Design a protein around this ligand. Sequence first.
Ligand SMILES: O[C@H]1[C@H](NCc2ccncc2)[C@H]2CO[C@H](O2)[C@@H]1N1CCOCC1
Length: 330
Amino acid sequence: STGSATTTPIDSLDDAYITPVQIGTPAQTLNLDFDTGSSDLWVFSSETTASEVDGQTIYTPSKSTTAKLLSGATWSISYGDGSSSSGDVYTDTVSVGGLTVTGQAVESAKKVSSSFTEDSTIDGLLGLAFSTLNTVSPTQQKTFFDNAKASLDSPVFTADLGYHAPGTYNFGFIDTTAYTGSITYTAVSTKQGFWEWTSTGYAVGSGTFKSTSIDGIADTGTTLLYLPATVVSAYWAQVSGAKSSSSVGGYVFPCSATLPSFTFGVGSARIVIPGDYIDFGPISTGSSSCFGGIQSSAGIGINIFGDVALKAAFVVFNGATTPTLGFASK
Ligand SMILES: O[C@H]1[C@H](NCc2ccncc2)[C@H]2CO[C@H](O2)[C@@H]1N1CCOCC1
């Protein structure tokens, strides 16, 4: 089997991407944030505190003839931005772009933090990291990809995120027309439950390439590119007037500046992030100070190849017995 679904930026800045997901019988279609940095499928629901729902489409398990309450199961998750959600668990039928999993754990939110409430375009998350990170207690549950893997033509999924444009998540096959050149594969550590890999280095603009190992995770659920302070300083040094602002919470730059590209290494291969991918617009409405899309990972404790990086590539998440990651230019 295979599945294929279009993923869409939620706003003009590509702050996140949503992908339609069918849940239950008859189908309830929710637009979910596919997140390769976490492993819970959770949704706004009929059980979510009314004051915490503001525009989202909700899952109503009582209207799904295939929904079954998972007795005694609860979940609670917190993300790197301080956001959180929690609730109980159903199993139900879940389909993504024609690919169907029966008995998928669907985690129904009773509570969500304010940042989720405020984001009307995101109806929940679909985690695609390794199932070891799933928060369902007292019995941990499997991700959608884990549940589908054995039925797929090939045990893989691919992320093809667009810059200010639609993109695609495919399951079970590699679309050889979606990229240029070759896919370079690189080793993955699953020891922290992430798609964790080691970049071979970087370049800033037309600068010489610096060979240096950068360990980080491929995370579709993070907007920006988070890299070591040394690297990030080297990047913003090439932008006149850029500086790190504590008040704003990172590097900002004059909106009139021309941003240099940023290149990261995958083995001997190179992925080039165009400069305008790194522009996240005025820090507040009407400001001529803009927020940078490359930021220091010093506070986070881990390097994150988020959407800013991933949308510059066609990315293969290979879930073979020994998982690997593939990157191609596009
Ligand atoms: O990018 C954010 C994510 N929200 C993106 C977002 C979604 C929707 N609208 C705006 C932003 C969530 C998931 O992991 C973190 O929090 C991630 N960062 C990690 C390190 O820097 C701090 C936060």
